[PDB]
Every structure is written in structure tokens, then in C-alpha cells.
């Protein structure tokens with residue numbers, strides 16, 4: 081049974097609600113992005129209308145084989161009428177194809193559903209600037225002040241400088257980057273660009289990347305591992321055992337691996353500056369954990385919400401415990417008292 085925070089009142093609509101069977105009253109199923117916790121339940125046998133971005137719709141058709149007649153892609157930043165209700169899709173600054181949804185209810189209520197997002201000041205000049213929002217369905221993944229991390233630009237600068245240093249010292253080092261979903265593609269694309277290489281990967285991952293509308297992608301990626309000195313591997317193989325095994329397969333081309341694990345936040349963030357980050361090393365293998373986030377930090381979240389001044393907030397993440405829910409409600413009331421709405 082579908083929970084309340086996935087239903088849009090006054091409509092036939094749900095958001096990211098594919099794992100509950102046929103939801104009573106639902107005439108259109110929105111999907112904010114192509115991450116498994118959100119698409120859970122979609123397959124080629126789905127027969128209701130799915131509304132989403134063009135990029136999400138490429139992935140539904142090619143990766144999950146959803147039939148074309150049930151895929152309804154909408155352009156961003158454009159007023160669209162769906163089943164008699166005005167909606168707008170906005171870039172969420174999450175993974176490729178990720179959106180926020182603005183719903184203009186027939187009674188005059190305006191609702192914003194952020195999906196998963198990384199709040200940015202640039203959102204304060206989208207179509208959000210123009211009008212008031214009564215209800216906010218908020219990605220609260222890192223809704224606590226201990227959650228700090230650097231800008232994505234600082235993290236990419238660290239990774240580029242680390243990779244270029246290592247490979248210039250040893251032209252025989254291979255760079256490996258972990259992945260387990262879409263998102264965070266800048267990590268491996270920025271490193272391959274500094275090294276003058278294409279990124280090498282499995283056929284399954286190449287196919288996924290080919291759905292993302294990234295400009296000049298055929299110039300940047302390949303399935304020919306032998307021609308590439310930046311390889312992608314599943315995240316589960318980014319450990320000393322899995323990397324050793326991989327280096328065996330490379331036919332004595334390389335004698336060292338430098339590997340990156342983009343994580344979200346980790347508690348080493350509460351002590352260490354990005355500049356000061358060091359790897360774990362075993363012999364000729366080094367592994368860096370880098371804090372590349374596609375979700376708001378606490379401070380970014382707070383800034384966005386204080387600017388928007390919603391009347392009510394409904395969290396969509398960390399909702400399963402009373403301690404989580406009570407923590408989040410306390411921060412929402414602080415933010416409202418400090419800003420005066």
C-alpha cells in the first residue's frame with residue numbers, strides 16, 4: 081500500500097510509486113529520476129501512463145523495456161497540461177534526467193516535489209521565483225548540521241590533480257573509478273579528459289551512458305578496454321582483492337592502480353578537509369574515497385527552504401523512525417523562526 085507522502089492530493093497523481101501494484105485513483109504515475117529505490121516495480125509489463133523527463137524516458141525504454149506507448153516525456157521549464165492539471169518539470173541538480181515537479185492544483189494550491197535534489201542558489205531564478213508554494217515534499221537525506229561536504233567543483237579539482245600527478249610520475253599506472261547507478265559521471269569524465277584518454281567500460285554500462293544526452297559522448301567513452309587508461313568497474317569490485325584481479329586481466333600493460341570511490345558523506349568529513357584526503361594503500365594499489373554528493377548539504381537545504389518559505393513541509397527521506405521525524409521537525413521550526421515566515 082502506497083504511503084501518503086507519495087500521493088498528490090486533489091489529483092489522480094502519484095510520485096515514485098511503482099512498487100505498490102495498481103494504486104486506487106491513480107491516472108498518471110510520475111517518475112522523478114532513474115534510481116532503483118524510485119523506479120522499484122516498473123518493468124516491460126507496466127500498462128499505465130508514466131510521466132518523466134526525456135532522459136528518464138530513454139532509460140525506461142532501453143534498460144527496463146517499458147513500451148513506448150506508456151512513456152510520456154515532458155520538456156523542462158515549460159508549462160504542460162496533464163489530465164487537466166498544469167505541471168512544470170525543473171532540473172533537480174541530482175543525476176542525469178532528474179527533475180523536481182511543480183503542480184498547480186485546480187483549487188489554487190501550488191505544490192513543489194523536489195524528488196532527490198542538490199539545492200543550489202541558481203534555483204532561486206528558475207520558474208520558482210514567480211509564485212508562492214503552499215506544500216513542499218522535500219528530499220531530507222542530509223537534514224542535520226553534521227552533514228557537511230565540499231562543492232562538486234572542489235572535489236573534481238582534487239580528483240583531476242591526483243590522477244594527473246600519479247600517471248605523469250608512472251605512465252604505467254591505470255586509473256579505475258567505481259559506479260553502481262547513474263550519476264556522478266563528471267568524476268570519470270574529468271579524469272579521462274586530463275589524461276587524454278577515453279573511458280573504458282562494460283557493454284551494459286556503455287548502453288546506459290548512451291541514453292543520457294551528454295554532448296559529444298561518442299568522443300568520450302568506449303567498450304574497448306585495451307585502448308583506454310581510465311576503466312569503470314562496479315562499486316563492489318573497488319577493494320584490494322577486486323582490483324588485483326582486474327590488474328591480472330590487463331596483460332602486463334600496467335604495474336600500479338589508482339582507484340576512486342565516489343561516496344556520499346562519510347564521518348571522515350567531520351575531521352578532514354578535501355585537500356588533506358589520503359588513500360588506503362596495499363602494495364601497488366591505492367583507493368581514494370571522495371565525497372562527491374548529489375544531495376543537498378544541510379546548509380544548502382536550509383538556504384533553499386528559507387528562500388522558498390513554504391507553508392507546510394513533508395519529508396520524503398528518513399521518515400521511518402520517530403527520532404528522525406522529530407529531529408527534522410525541530411529544524412524546520414528553527415528555520416521558520418529565524419527567517420520569520
Ligand code: NI
Pocket residue numbers: 113115174196
Ligand atoms: Ni536518487
